Amino acid sequence: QKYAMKPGLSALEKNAVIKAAYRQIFERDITKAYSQSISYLESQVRNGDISMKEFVRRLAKSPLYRKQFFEPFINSRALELAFRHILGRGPSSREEVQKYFSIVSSGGLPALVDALVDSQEYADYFGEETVPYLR
């Protein structure tokens, strides 16, 4: 089951695409109703002013994402969570854990998100338009 945001999709499909995005990132049925920010963000991705990649990015940086999947955890644990939500897999090696560990110490949640989202792997699997999915 793969979902991709494109500007000319029907509203039914767009709704389905957005819903998948929240479920993959927040692991629950968040809605535009949750905050001004998320609603604004949703309007951006729905209208094509930002791509799906950019939507995932801003979503993963949000206070909701931060309080559920970053703030309560040690660097080590927060990065494996972000891996799963953004990349659809767990970290593959101790060398990869280390790479992202320093990024987290260095630039916290925003740097963790940017790095996962801007990796060549993310580009290969999900690109600009596709919701991350469990691999």
Q: Give the nearer residue to Na ion in terms of CB position, either 55 or 126.
A: 55
Contact range with Na ion by CB under 5 A, out of 15-23, 80-88, 102-110, 121-129: 102-110
* Residues 16-75, interacting with Na ion (CB under 5 A): 35, 37, 62-64
CA distance 15 to 65: 21
* Direct distance between the N- and C-terminal alpha carbons of the chain, in angstroms, rounded to an integer: 11
- DSSP states along 70-103: TTTS-HHHHHHHHIIIIISS----HHHHHHHHHH
Q: Give the nearer residue to Na ion in terms of CB position, either 118 or 128.
A: 118
CA distance 135 to 129: 17
Q: With binding defined as CB under 5 A, does residue 103 bind Na ion? A: no
Q: Which of 31, 110, 123, 134 binds Na ion (CB under 5 A)?
A: 110
Binding site for Na ion (CB under 5 A): 35, 37, 62-64, 110
